[PDB]
Write a protein that binds this ligand. Structure first.
Ligand SMILES: *[C@@H]1O[C@H](CO)[C@@H](O[C@@H]2O[C@H](CO)[C@@H](O[C@@H]3O[C@H](CO)[C@@H](O)[C@H](O[C@H]4O[C@H](CO)[C@@H](O)[C@H](O)[C@@H]4O)[C@@H]3O)[C@H](O)[C@H]2NC(C)=O)[C@H](O)[C@H]1NC(C)=O
Ligand SMILES: NC(=O)c1ccc[n+]([C@@H]2O[C@H](COP(=O)([O-])OP(=O)(O)OC[C@H]3O[C@@H](n4cnc5c(N)ncnc54)[C@H](O)[C@@H]3O)[C@@H](O)[C@H]2O)c1
Ligand SMILES: *[C@@H]1O[C@H](CO)[C@@H](O[C@@H]2O[C@H](CO)[C@@H](O)[C@H](O)[C@H]2NC(C)=O)[C@H](O)[C@H]1NC(C)=O
Ligand SMILES: [Cu+2]
Ligand SMILES: [Cu+2]
Ligand SMILES: [Cu+2]
Ligand SMILES: [Cu+2]
Length: 534
């Protein structure tokens, strides 16, 4: 249907690459003698000239940018990020893809108000993967993400660097953060506030930029795709502009949780909200051509319900040089890793139905705000469970995210007989798309940390109103590892704290090297991640 946003100068602005976030300093962990990397992120309003000929757009971003700066953390290095709220609404930061303790996981009620900050202590122990950090504050997640509270967090591993995949952040390893937004006639954003169904958006962005281009060399590039949209799911394919409908083959090498066992040869990538897929596209056969990254219409080929507009088929353009500057010395190995799948289980799966109760998106008839009923599962830490995730609906689709766990997609059924499990779903994931009338069974190890965690639809409109519930990964009174201060996400030790803007800007008081050092050393003494010591 007709684009509502003003006409954009398509494929005229280069793909921006979020800058790498650098730690401010490192603190000696007194427990193990190891350096914890300490970062400061200031959440703050800013404007961006999205449309060259109109007004600017009001955004609120990590370090006053959108997307947020890209973290780059080696496995084994613990991180503390101080997220400082200097904006006009509360925040709760979730590191999506991280087995963070309950009080470091962005629990929706665990907010930071303006004039407060929270210290988030991250383990960085899991398999190399593309994580992303984004807002999760109760009822306002859609608008905080949409206005720019989302960024990339790359967990790296020398074992994976040895695979010799296309490499170099912003070189041949390119972040591809997809969003879908709507603008006013004056080039500001149309708010998601009030929207209770879905906010599709009609303007497709990569890394915060409508319909960009990038100059590429005729060689292999690694693309880290993230659907950071409020409501839009994609069916991604690449086509030569001389044959705009002919899908060019590529390889999927990674899902949410990291590398697949083997690359998946693919010409169409289904990607819904919060899913990450890492692609190697080989431009060597298309020297001198323009390749368009495109998006499947008819509501993602009948899998979705998303509205399609005049330009939502277009994502961006790659302009392929005649030659390389230097040889492509990268490969895509047939054997990427042994995926650490859970031990299969025969116990009857739990059932979760993603539907609506009046005007509210619900799980098993419950809204997250109904505290009394929203705890839908107690799972003893160490258990492997199958959950059957049911979308009986034809009029909505639900990408389901389970916090804490990596899971295996066991099965999909479709009441429109559309598809079963996809080859790029072969590995470990933390989000799975329930298309129209789809039921998916996932299997997960509920390990290794006890605590109360969320699971929900990652359609942020659905999430906010109010398609989200909790599970408790439980332990016995004798388990140890300081579980009594780490199971409740609202534990007062880990709560946000007020600050004065003067002390932040002068890096004095609570922001002095001495206060930061004392705070982190105190947090580290409780040993949040010791139970995953192997
Ligand atoms: C999510 O699951 C966690 C477990 O992983 C769970 O935390 C556990 O809560 C229970 C009950 O509150 C705790 O056991 C308590 O220990 C304290 C302190 O010594 C006592 O106050 C309690 O004693 C009363 O109740 C006993 C048991 O019925 C009676 O025998 C006694 O007479 C007392 O009246 C009680 O034993 C346990 O310590 C925690 N475990 C941890 C590791 O924190 C949590 O409650 C669950 N969360 C939610 C939101 O459901
Ligand atoms: N167990 C039960 O309660 C029960 C009994 C009989 C039938 N059903 C099932 O109900 C389903 C209804 O048939 P359908 O596939 O035509 O509809 P559906 O499942 O897509 O929609 C169910 C209801 O929600 C409404 N709806 C759809 N999309 C919506 C959206 N985005 N926002 C708000 N409301 C929306 C529909 O108009 C309808 O009134 C069938 O699959 C049928 O098998 C359930
Ligand atoms: C649980 O957390 C407490 C509090 O940080 C730890 O107790 C501290 O332990 C360190 C090193 O053993 C001491 O120097 C501190 O003086 C302790 N503080 C208190 C209040 O006791 C304890 O080690 C942690 N337990 C586990 C199993 O991690
Ligand atoms: Cu998320
Ligand atoms: Cu998450
Ligand atoms: Cu949903
Ligand atoms: Cu979440």
């Amino acid at each position: 249907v007709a684009q509502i946003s003003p006409q954009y100068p398509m494929f005229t602005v280069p793909l921006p690459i979020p800058p790498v976030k650098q730690p401010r300093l490192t603190v000696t962990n007194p427990v193990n003698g190891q350096e914890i990397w300490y970062y400061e992120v200031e959440i703050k309003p800013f404007t961006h000239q999205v449309y060259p000929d109109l007004g600017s757009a009001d955004l609120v971003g990590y370090d006053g940018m959108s997307p947020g700066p890209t973290f780059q953390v080696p496995r084994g290095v613990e991180t503390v990020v101080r997220f400082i709220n200097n904006a006009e609404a509360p925040n709760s930061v979730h590191l999506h893809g991280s087995f963070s303790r309950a009080a470091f996981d962005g629990w929706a009620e665990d907010i930071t108000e303006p004039g407060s900050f929270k210290d988030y202590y991250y383990p960085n122990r899991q398999s190399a993967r593309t994580l992303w950090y984004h807002d999760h504050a109760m009822h306002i997640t859609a608008e905080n993400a949409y206005r720019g509270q989302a960024g990339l967090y790359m967990l790296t591993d020398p074992a994976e660097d040895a695979l010799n995949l296309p490499s170099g952040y912003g070189e041949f390893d390119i972040p591809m953060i997809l969003t879908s937004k709507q603008y006013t006639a004056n080039g500001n954003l149309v708010t998601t506030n009030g929207e209770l169904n879905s906010f599709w958006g009609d303007v497709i962005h990569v890394n915060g930029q409508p319909w960009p281009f990038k100059n590429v060399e005729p060689r292999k590039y690694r693309f880290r795709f993230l659907d950071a949209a409020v409501s839009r799911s994609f069916g991604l394919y690449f086509a030569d502009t001389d044959a705009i409908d002919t899908r060019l083959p590529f390889k999927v090498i990674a899902s949410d949780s990291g590398l697949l066992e083997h690359p998946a040869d693919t010409s169409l990538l289904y990607i819904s909200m919060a899913e990450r897929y890492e692609v190697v596209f080989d431009f060597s056969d298309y020297a001198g051509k323009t390749i368009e990254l495109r998006n499947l219409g008819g509501s993602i080929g009948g899998i979705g319900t998303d509205t399609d507009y005049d330009n939502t088929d277009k994502v961006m353009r790659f302009v392929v040089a005649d030659d390389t500057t230097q040889p492509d010395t990268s490969v895509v190995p047939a054997n990427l890793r042994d995926v650490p799948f859970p031990s299969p289980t025969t116990n009857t799966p739990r059932q979760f139905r993603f539907g609506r109760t009046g005007p509210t998106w619900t799980i098993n008839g419950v809204a997250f705000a109904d505290v009394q009923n929203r705890l839908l599962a107690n799972v003893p830490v160490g258990t492997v469970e199958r959950w059957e995730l049911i979308n009986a609906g034809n009029g909505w689709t639900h990408p389901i995210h389970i916090h804490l766990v990596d899971f295996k997609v066991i099965s999909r059924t479709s009441g429109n007989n559309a598809r079963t499990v996809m080859p790029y779903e072969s590995g470990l994931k933390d989000v799975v798309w329930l298309g129209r009338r789809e039921t998916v069974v996932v299997e997960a190890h509920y390990a290794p940390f006890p605590g109360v965690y969320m699971f929900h639809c990652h359609n942020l409109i659905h999430e906010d109103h109010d398609m989200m519930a909790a599970f408790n990964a439980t332990v016995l009174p004798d388990y140890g590892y300081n579980a009594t201060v780490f199971v409740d996400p609202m534990e007062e030790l880990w709560q946000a704290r007020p600050y004065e803007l003067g002390e932040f800007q002068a890096q004095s008081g609570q922001f002095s090297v001495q206060a930061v050092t004392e705070r982190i050393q105190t947090m580290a003494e409780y040993r949040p991640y010791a139970a995953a010591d192997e």
